[PDB]
Amino acid sequence: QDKCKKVYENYPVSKCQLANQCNYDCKLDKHARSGECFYDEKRNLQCICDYCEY
């Protein structure tokens, strides 16, 4: 698979500064493995829920 992390759909960026938020939530709100706030070559942070990444 060319992907193993599902973006927490919407999710008000507001916070997105460190772990916890996306991490914890993903670790349960989406039965994921982990997560964190990330962006692309555009400057847009979102809560990424990781399914396969340690």
Summary?
The protein is of the alpha+beta class and 54 residues long. It is built from one helix and three strands.
Describe this structure in words.
The protein has 54 residues and is of the alpha+beta class. It has one domain (2-54): 2-Layer Sandwich (Defensin A-like), CATH 3.30.30.10. Helix content is 17%, strand content 24%. It is built from 1 helix and 3 strands, in the order βαββ. It has one helix at 21-29; strands at residues 5-7, 34-38, 46-50. A 3-stranded antiparallel sheet has the order 1-3-2, covered by helices on one side. A hairpin with a 7-residue loop joins strand 2 (34-38) and strand 3 (46-50). The longest helix is centred in the middle third of the chain and has 9 residues, at 21-29. This is Defensin-like protein. Taste-modifying protein; sweet-tasting. It is 2000 sweeter than sucrose on a molar basis. One of its GO terms (cellular component) is extracellular region.
* CATH C-level category: Alpha Beta
Radius of gyration using CA atoms only:
10 Å
CATH architecture level-2 label: 2-Layer Sandwich
What fold name goes in the CATH topology slot?
A: Defensin A-like
Number of strands: 3
Could you give the distance between the termini?
16 Å
Shape: globular
Helix-strand makeup class: alpha+beta
If helices are DSSP runs of H or I spanning 4 or more residues, what is the number of helices?
Answer: 1
Count of domains: 1
Taking strands numbered 1, 2, ... along the chain, how are they ordered across the largest sheet? Answer: 1-3-2
Query: How would you name the CATH homologous superfamily?
Result: Knottin, scorpion toxin-like
User: Roughly what fraction of the amino acids lie in strands?
Assistant: 15-25%
Q: Please give the largest β-sheet.
A: 3 strands, antiparallel
User: What portion of residues is helical?
Assistant: 10-25%
Would you list the SSEs in sequence order as H and E? EHEE
PDB class: sweet protein
Keywords: sweet protein, cysteine-stabilized alpha-beta
Assembly: monomeric
Entry title: solution structure of the sweet protein brazzein, NMR, 43 structures
